[PDB]
mmCIF file of all heavy atoms in Angstrom:
data_model
loop_
_atom_site.group_PDB
_atom_site.id
_atom_site.type_symbol
_atom_site.label_atom_id
_atom_site.label_comp_id
_atom_site.label_asym_id
_atom_site.label_seq_id
_atom_site.Cartn_x
_atom_site.Cartn_y
_atom_site.Cartn_z
ATOM 1 N N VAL A 1 0.855 -1.171 0.000
ATOM 2 C CA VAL A 1 0.000 0.000 0.000
ATOM 3 C C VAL A 1 0.891 1.221 0.000
ATOM 4 O O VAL A 1 1.899 1.265 0.710
ATOM 5 C CB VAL A 1 -0.960 0.000 1.200
ATOM 6 C CG1 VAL A 1 -0.195 -0.080 2.478
ATOM 7 C CG2 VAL A 1 -1.815 1.234 1.181
ATOM 8 N N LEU A 2 0.571 2.175 -0.852
ATOM 9 C CA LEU A 2 1.291 3.433 -0.940
ATOM 10 C C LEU A 2 0.262 4.528 -0.752
ATOM 11 O O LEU A 2 -0.506 4.820 -1.670
ATOM 12 C CB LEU A 2 1.988 3.557 -2.287
ATOM 13 C CG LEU A 2 2.710 4.855 -2.601
ATOM 14 C CD1 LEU A 2 3.848 5.036 -1.649
ATOM 15 C CD2 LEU A 2 3.212 4.817 -4.015
ATOM 16 N N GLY A 3 0.228 5.122 0.426
ATOM 17 C CA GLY A 3 -0.756 6.134 0.712
ATOM 18 C C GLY A 3 -0.667 6.561 2.152
ATOM 19 O O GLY A 3 0.130 6.027 2.923
ATOM 20 N N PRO A 4 -1.490 7.516 2.554
ATOM 21 C CA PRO A 4 -1.352 8.073 3.898
ATOM 22 C C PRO A 4 -1.673 7.035 4.956
ATOM 23 O O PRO A 4 -2.516 6.158 4.760
ATOM 24 C CB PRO A 4 -2.370 9.210 3.911
ATOM 25 C CG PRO A 4 -3.388 8.780 2.949
ATOM 26 C CD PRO A 4 -2.680 8.028 1.868
ATOM 27 N N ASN A 5 -0.971 7.141 6.085
ATOM 28 C CA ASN A 5 -1.133 6.212 7.201
ATOM 29 C C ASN A 5 -0.986 4.768 6.737
ATOM 30 O O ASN A 5 -1.826 3.913 7.012
ATOM 31 C CB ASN A 5 -2.470 6.436 7.900
ATOM 32 C CG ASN A 5 -2.675 7.879 8.290
ATOM 33 O OD1 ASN A 5 -1.784 8.507 8.855
ATOM 34 N ND2 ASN A 5 -3.852 8.413 7.995
ATOM 35 N N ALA A 6 0.085 4.505 5.994
ATOM 36 C CA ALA A 6 0.291 3.179 5.433
ATOM 37 C C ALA A 6 0.443 2.122 6.511
ATOM 38 O O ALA A 6 -0.157 1.050 6.424
ATOM 39 C CB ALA A 6 1.519 3.185 4.532
ATOM 40 N N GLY A 7 1.239 2.401 7.537
ATOM 41 C CA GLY A 7 1.507 1.384 8.539
ATOM 42 C C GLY A 7 0.266 0.976 9.307
ATOM 43 O O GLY A 7 0.083 -0.199 9.639
ATOM 44 N N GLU A 8 -0.596 1.938 9.614
ATOM 45 C CA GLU A 8 -1.822 1.608 10.317
ATOM 46 C C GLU A 8 -2.685 0.671 9.488
ATOM 47 O O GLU A 8 -3.257 -0.282 10.018
ATOM 48 C CB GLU A 8 -2.569 2.887 10.669
ATOM 49 C CG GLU A 8 -2.055 3.542 11.933
ATOM 50 C CD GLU A 8 -1.184 4.747 11.666
ATOM 51 O OE1 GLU A 8 -0.974 5.078 10.485
ATOM 52 O OE2 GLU A 8 -0.707 5.368 12.641
ATOM 53 N N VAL A 9 -2.773 0.907 8.183
ATOM 54 C CA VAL A 9 -3.540 0.005 7.333
ATOM 55 C C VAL A 9 -2.856 -1.347 7.233
ATOM 56 O O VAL A 9 -3.517 -2.385 7.138
ATOM 57 C CB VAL A 9 -3.751 0.622 5.945
ATOM 58 C CG1 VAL A 9 -4.610 -0.292 5.114
ATOM 59 C CG2 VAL A 9 -4.386 1.988 6.066
ATOM 60 N N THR A 10 -1.522 -1.356 7.245
ATOM 61 C CA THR A 10 -0.752 -2.567 6.979
ATOM 62 C C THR A 10 -0.720 -3.522 8.162
ATOM 63 O O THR A 10 -0.634 -4.738 7.968
ATOM 64 C CB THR A 10 0.671 -2.186 6.590
ATOM 65 O OG1 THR A 10 0.634 -1.465 5.356
ATOM 66 C CG2 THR A 10 1.523 -3.407 6.405
ATOM 67 N N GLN A 11 -0.762 -2.998 9.382
ATOM 68 C CA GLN A 11 -0.732 -3.870 10.548
ATOM 69 C C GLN A 11 -1.833 -4.919 10.474
ATOM 70 O O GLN A 11 -1.586 -6.121 10.644
ATOM 71 C CB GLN A 11 -0.861 -3.040 11.819
ATOM 72 C CG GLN A 11 -0.868 -3.871 13.059
ATOM 73 C CD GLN A 11 0.483 -4.461 13.355
ATOM 74 O OE1 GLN A 11 1.350 -3.800 13.917
ATOM 75 N NE2 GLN A 11 0.674 -5.713 12.972
ATOM 76 N N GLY A 12 -3.056 -4.483 10.190
ATOM 77 C CA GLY A 12 -4.169 -5.409 10.176
ATOM 78 C C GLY A 12 -4.049 -6.456 9.090
ATOM 79 O O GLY A 12 -4.307 -7.637 9.321
ATOM 80 N N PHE A 13 -3.660 -6.047 7.890
ATOM 81 C CA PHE A 13 -3.564 -7.027 6.821
ATOM 82 C C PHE A 13 -2.388 -7.964 7.030
ATOM 83 O O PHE A 13 -2.422 -9.103 6.561
ATOM 84 C CB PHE A 13 -3.501 -6.326 5.474
ATOM 85 C CG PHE A 13 -4.812 -5.758 5.053
ATOM 86 C CD1 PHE A 13 -5.074 -4.410 5.178
ATOM 87 C CD2 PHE A 13 -5.800 -6.580 4.565
ATOM 88 C CE1 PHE A 13 -6.284 -3.894 4.800
ATOM 89 C CE2 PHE A 13 -7.011 -6.069 4.189
ATOM 90 C CZ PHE A 13 -7.254 -4.726 4.306
ATOM 91 N N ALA A 14 -1.356 -7.530 7.753
ATOM 92 C CA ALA A 14 -0.314 -8.472 8.147
ATOM 93 C C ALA A 14 -0.868 -9.518 9.100
ATOM 94 O O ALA A 14 -0.615 -10.724 8.941
ATOM 95 C CB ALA A 14 0.854 -7.736 8.793
ATOM 96 N N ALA A 15 -1.645 -9.077 10.088
ATOM 97 C CA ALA A 15 -2.274 -10.035 10.988
ATOM 98 C C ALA A 15 -3.188 -10.976 10.217
ATOM 99 O O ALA A 15 -3.290 -12.161 10.543
ATOM 100 C CB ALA A 15 -3.052 -9.309 12.078
ATOM 101 N N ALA A 16 -3.854 -10.463 9.185
ATOM 102 C CA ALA A 16 -4.685 -11.319 8.349
ATOM 103 C C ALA A 16 -3.848 -12.325 7.580
ATOM 104 O O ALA A 16 -4.243 -13.486 7.452
ATOM 105 C CB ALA A 16 -5.509 -10.473 7.385
ATOM 106 N N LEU A 17 -2.693 -11.903 7.067
ATOM 107 C CA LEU A 17 -1.839 -12.826 6.332
ATOM 108 C C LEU A 17 -1.381 -13.960 7.226
ATOM 109 O O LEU A 17 -1.257 -15.102 6.776
ATOM 110 C CB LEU A 17 -0.636 -12.101 5.738
ATOM 111 C CG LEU A 17 -0.953 -11.125 4.611
ATOM 112 C CD1 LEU A 17 0.255 -10.944 3.727
ATOM 113 C CD2 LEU A 17 -2.138 -11.597 3.813
ATOM 114 N N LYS A 18 -1.117 -13.668 8.499
ATOM 115 C CA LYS A 18 -0.813 -14.759 9.420
ATOM 116 C C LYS A 18 -1.976 -15.736 9.541
ATOM 117 O O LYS A 18 -1.766 -16.908 9.870
ATOM 118 C CB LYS A 18 -0.434 -14.209 10.789
ATOM 119 C CG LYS A 18 0.982 -13.686 10.851
ATOM 120 C CD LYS A 18 1.931 -14.769 11.304
ATOM 121 C CE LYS A 18 3.356 -14.261 11.344
ATOM 122 N NZ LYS A 18 4.062 -14.471 10.053
ATOM 123 N N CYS A 19 -3.200 -15.285 9.283
ATOM 124 C CA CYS A 19 -4.373 -16.149 9.306
ATOM 125 C C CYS A 19 -4.663 -16.799 7.961
ATOM 126 O O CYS A 19 -5.665 -17.514 7.839
ATOM 127 C CB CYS A 19 -5.607 -15.360 9.743
ATOM 128 S SG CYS A 19 -5.578 -14.731 11.429
ATOM 129 N N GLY A 20 -3.836 -16.561 6.952
ATOM 130 C CA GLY A 20 -4.095 -17.135 5.648
ATOM 131 C C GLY A 20 -5.263 -16.506 4.929
ATOM 132 O O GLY A 20 -6.107 -17.224 4.383
ATOM 133 N N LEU A 21 -5.355 -15.179 4.942
ATOM 134 C CA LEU A 21 -6.418 -14.485 4.231
ATOM 135 C C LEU A 21 -6.440 -14.884 2.765
ATOM 136 O O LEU A 21 -5.397 -14.977 2.118
ATOM 137 C CB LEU A 21 -6.229 -12.978 4.353
ATOM 138 C CG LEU A 21 -7.222 -12.169 3.532
ATOM 139 C CD1 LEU A 21 -8.520 -12.097 4.273
ATOM 140 C CD2 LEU A 21 -6.693 -10.782 3.262
ATOM 141 N N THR A 22 -7.640 -15.111 2.243
ATOM 142 C CA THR A 22 -7.838 -15.491 0.857
ATOM 143 C C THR A 22 -8.547 -14.363 0.124
ATOM 144 O O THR A 22 -9.250 -13.553 0.731
ATOM 145 C CB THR A 22 -8.658 -16.773 0.748
ATOM 146 O OG1 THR A 22 -9.948 -16.559 1.329
ATOM 147 C CG2 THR A 22 -7.978 -17.879 1.504
ATOM 148 N N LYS A 23 -8.351 -14.312 -1.194
ATOM 149 C CA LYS A 23 -8.963 -13.253 -1.988
ATOM 150 C C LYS A 23 -10.474 -13.250 -1.827
ATOM 151 O O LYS A 23 -11.095 -12.184 -1.769
ATOM 152 C CB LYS A 23 -8.575 -13.410 -3.456
ATOM 153 C CG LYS A 23 -9.303 -12.469 -4.396
ATOM 154 C CD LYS A 23 -8.967 -11.020 -4.128
ATOM 155 C CE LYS A 23 -9.695 -10.120 -5.110
ATOM 156 N NZ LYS A 23 -9.422 -8.677 -4.884
ATOM 157 N N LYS A 24 -11.084 -14.428 -1.728
ATOM 158 C CA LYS A 24 -12.531 -14.485 -1.565
ATOM 159 C C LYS A 24 -12.965 -13.843 -0.255
ATOM 160 O O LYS A 24 -13.876 -13.006 -0.235
ATOM 161 C CB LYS A 24 -13.012 -15.930 -1.642
ATOM 162 C CG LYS A 24 -14.513 -16.059 -1.554
ATOM 163 C CD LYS A 24 -14.953 -17.501 -1.682
ATOM 164 C CE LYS A 24 -16.461 -17.612 -1.566
ATOM 165 N NZ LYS A 24 -16.914 -19.024 -1.690
ATOM 166 N N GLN A 25 -12.321 -14.213 0.853
ATOM 167 C CA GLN A 25 -12.710 -13.622 2.126
ATOM 168 C C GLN A 25 -12.487 -12.122 2.113
ATOM 169 O O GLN A 25 -13.376 -11.357 2.496
ATOM 170 C CB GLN A 25 -11.945 -14.259 3.279
ATOM 171 C CG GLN A 25 -12.495 -15.601 3.701
ATOM 172 C CD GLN A 25 -11.826 -16.125 4.950
ATOM 173 O OE1 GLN A 25 -10.924 -15.492 5.492
ATOM 174 N NE2 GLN A 25 -12.271 -17.282 5.422
ATOM 175 N N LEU A 26 -11.321 -11.685 1.641
ATOM 176 C CA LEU A 26 -11.042 -10.258 1.537
ATOM 177 C C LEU A 26 -12.143 -9.545 0.770
ATOM 178 O O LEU A 26 -12.599 -8.472 1.173
ATOM 179 C CB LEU A 26 -9.692 -10.042 0.865
ATOM 180 C CG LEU A 26 -9.331 -8.593 0.597
ATOM 181 C CD1 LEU A 26 -9.373 -7.835 1.891
ATOM 182 C CD2 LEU A 26 -7.962 -8.518 -0.016
ATOM 183 N N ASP A 27 -12.584 -10.129 -0.347
ATOM 184 C CA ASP A 27 -13.700 -9.542 -1.083
ATOM 185 C C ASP A 27 -14.973 -9.525 -0.252
ATOM 186 O O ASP A 27 -15.790 -8.609 -0.391
ATOM 187 C CB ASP A 27 -13.934 -10.300 -2.384
ATOM 188 C CG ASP A 27 -14.459 -9.405 -3.482
ATOM 189 O OD1 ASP A 27 -15.012 -8.337 -3.153
ATOM 190 O OD2 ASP A 27 -14.322 -9.766 -4.672
ATOM 191 N N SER A 28 -15.162 -10.518 0.612
ATOM 192 C CA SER A 28 -16.367 -10.539 1.427
ATOM 193 C C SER A 28 -16.300 -9.581 2.603
ATOM 194 O O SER A 28 -17.351 -9.211 3.131
ATOM 195 C CB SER A 28 -16.640 -11.950 1.947
ATOM 196 O OG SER A 28 -17.976 -12.064 2.394
ATOM 197 N N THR A 29 -15.105 -9.170 3.020
ATOM 198 C CA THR A 29 -14.995 -8.216 4.114
ATOM 199 C C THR A 29 -15.628 -6.903 3.702
ATOM 200 O O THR A 29 -15.475 -6.461 2.563
ATOM 201 C CB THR A 29 -13.541 -7.972 4.499
ATOM 202 O OG1 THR A 29 -12.925 -7.123 3.521
ATOM 203 C CG2 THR A 29 -12.775 -9.276 4.615
ATOM 204 N N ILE A 30 -16.349 -6.301 4.608
ATOM 205 C CA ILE A 30 -17.027 -5.045 4.339
ATOM 206 C C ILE A 30 -16.109 -3.896 4.707
ATOM 207 O O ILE A 30 -15.616 -3.811 5.836
ATOM 208 C CB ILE A 30 -18.339 -4.967 5.125
ATOM 209 C CG1 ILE A 30 -19.313 -6.022 4.611
ATOM 210 C CG2 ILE A 30 -18.920 -3.586 5.018
ATOM 211 C CD1 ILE A 30 -20.506 -6.204 5.505
ATOM 212 N N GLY A 31 -15.909 -2.989 3.763
ATOM 213 C CA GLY A 31 -15.070 -1.843 4.020
ATOM 214 C C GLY A 31 -15.697 -0.910 5.032
ATOM 215 O O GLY A 31 -16.854 -1.048 5.419
ATOM 216 N N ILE A 32 -14.897 0.028 5.507
ATOM 217 C CA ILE A 32 -15.387 1.143 6.301
ATOM 218 C C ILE A 32 -15.424 2.372 5.415
ATOM 219 O O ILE A 32 -14.541 2.564 4.574
ATOM 220 C CB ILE A 32 -14.513 1.380 7.538
ATOM 221 C CG1 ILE A 32 -14.434 0.114 8.367
ATOM 222 C CG2 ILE A 32 -15.098 2.469 8.372
ATOM 223 C CD1 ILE A 32 -13.408 0.185 9.450
ATOM 224 N N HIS A 33 -16.451 3.194 5.579
ATOM 225 C CA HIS A 33 -16.509 4.334 4.699
ATOM 226 C C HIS A 33 -16.625 5.620 5.506
ATOM 227 O O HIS A 33 -17.297 5.637 6.540
ATOM 228 C CB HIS A 33 -17.694 4.201 3.738
ATOM 229 C CG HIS A 33 -17.633 5.124 2.566
ATOM 230 N ND1 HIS A 33 -16.702 4.983 1.562
ATOM 231 C CD2 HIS A 33 -18.405 6.178 2.219
ATOM 232 C CE1 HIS A 33 -16.891 5.925 0.656
ATOM 233 N NE2 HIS A 33 -17.920 6.663 1.030
ATOM 234 N N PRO A 34 -15.958 6.700 5.086
ATOM 235 C CA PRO A 34 -14.927 6.766 4.054
ATOM 236 C C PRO A 34 -13.538 6.691 4.656
ATOM 237 O O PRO A 34 -13.131 7.618 5.351
ATOM 238 C CB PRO A 34 -15.155 8.139 3.424
ATOM 239 C CG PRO A 34 -16.086 8.874 4.386
ATOM 240 C CD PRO A 34 -16.228 8.038 5.611
ATOM 241 N N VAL A 35 -12.811 5.619 4.376
ATOM 242 C CA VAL A 35 -11.463 5.435 4.884
ATOM 243 C C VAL A 35 -10.595 4.954 3.734
ATOM 244 O O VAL A 35 -11.055 4.188 2.882
ATOM 245 C CB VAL A 35 -11.424 4.433 6.054
ATOM 246 C CG1 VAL A 35 -10.052 4.380 6.647
ATOM 247 C CG2 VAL A 35 -12.413 4.816 7.115
ATOM 248 N N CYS A 36 -9.344 5.412 3.700
ATOM 249 C CA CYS A 36 -8.426 4.998 2.645
ATOM 250 C C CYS A 36 -8.373 3.482 2.530
ATOM 251 O O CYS A 36 -8.543 2.919 1.442
ATOM 252 C CB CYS A 36 -7.039 5.568 2.932
ATOM 253 S SG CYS A 36 -7.079 7.222 3.654
ATOM 254 N N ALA A 37 -8.199 2.805 3.665
ATOM 255 C CA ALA A 37 -8.012 1.361 3.669
ATOM 256 C C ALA A 37 -9.088 0.621 2.896
ATOM 257 O O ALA A 37 -8.827 -0.482 2.405
ATOM 258 C CB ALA A 37 -7.984 0.844 5.103
#
């Protein structure tokens, strides 16, 4: 990710990668609006 507050966004997805996040689940996750992440 290249954008403001990169590390804050990245911490969570790193924790997700430790859980074996899959593209399907990521697509099913509901975003927060309006947030860069």
